[PDB]
Amino acid sequence: SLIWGCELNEQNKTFEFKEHQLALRTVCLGDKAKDEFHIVEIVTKSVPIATLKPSILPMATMVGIELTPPVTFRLKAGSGPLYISGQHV
Amino acid sequence: SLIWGCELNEQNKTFEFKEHQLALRTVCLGDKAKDEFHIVEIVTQEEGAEKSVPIATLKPSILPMATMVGIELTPPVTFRLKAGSGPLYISGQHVA
Amino acid sequence: VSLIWGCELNEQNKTFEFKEHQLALRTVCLGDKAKDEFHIVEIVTQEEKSVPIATLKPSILPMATMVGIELTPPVTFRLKAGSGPLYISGQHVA
């Protein structure tokens, strides 16, 4: 077990996590993130897993989401920064 | 275990997922979704009568997403967009 | 053996009595036509003891995810406040 995390933003919309297993914990926006909808999806086919917005819902708790690498996280919408936290087992 | 997901919207209000188990994880709205209440329900047949069970109510400006916990379903299961224009995304893990 | 379950509570039918079995709750959410006011659902048992488990409101918090709540029938769900409809979803396992 090793705490893990990544940041997605306008300039770096994608992050890839390349046995091993990643359990997600939270997704949250930076305080300087544009006040608009942010959507993070997992790409393998893309699957939206979270929709956040600073003035509406600044974060979300992920539960029971365990992924087998490799997995790519893409910022479908929003300027970010958007942080994803998890445990790399 | 295989990550799964579907989109429901005004055009396609229904998605029929057809030993297997589907564990739901999240429900979230698209950024272009109409700012109104969206309701997703699971539909099954009960006593020869249709029975739908609402599992989530979302709205862009109020609650753009929800985390589903402990919801494991045995196919076949139909997800219906009871209300809202969508798009509404449902994510889950399809384990077989 | 599991079976998806659910019920609606509203002004007209403020109560629903769910009559080895266990009911695991999953979510509580409001209908889109529900009055924009606070809705409170409570579980009622004889000890009469009622235990509030959720407070919702259309314009504030339209739904809630229930976790680790497993009940042994019989159990009654009562709409303490609000016009509804308020839906409760769960899994009835046996």
Add this chain to the structure above:
Amino acid sequence: VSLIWGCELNEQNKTFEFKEHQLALRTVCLGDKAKDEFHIVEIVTQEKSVPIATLKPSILPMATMVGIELTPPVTFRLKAGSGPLYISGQHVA
């Protein structure tokens, strides 16, 4: 041996004590007549108070507690807010 449990905290009754036994918390939610202000519930041990929830009628009327299992005795204190604030849980033994 599980038994649904619950208590109400308010301005006049800021404290409630839960006096092997285990209490698993499920939800915290405000009454519809609760003052539109921040409500904070904390667990107190001897003291040692630990805030576990911050609610407000017009902002966040309730919260789902997860994985919180307590060994009696435990005291719940309404650090702030008029209430009523309800705490639900499963008392097993």
Add this chain to the structure above:
Amino acid sequence: SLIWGCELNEQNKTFEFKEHQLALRTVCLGDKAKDEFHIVEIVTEKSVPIATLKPSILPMATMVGIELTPPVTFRLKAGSGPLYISGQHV
């Protein structure tokens, strides 16, 4: 187990949790906290944001499945606080 908790604020932005495992339960703001975004991150250097709160938007958050092996430092990346973190020290 042993219930645990700490407060982070403008004047005490950091708290270090010095086999043992800390399971987090909730993060919530004090009623006197400045109405602005508060961000708490875990630091190991690698800092990992785990929560973004704001009094008038989202006053608290439930942490799930987050179990940590000491030592672990919690840092208030942003916000005046107070911000409370609750957990079970097993």
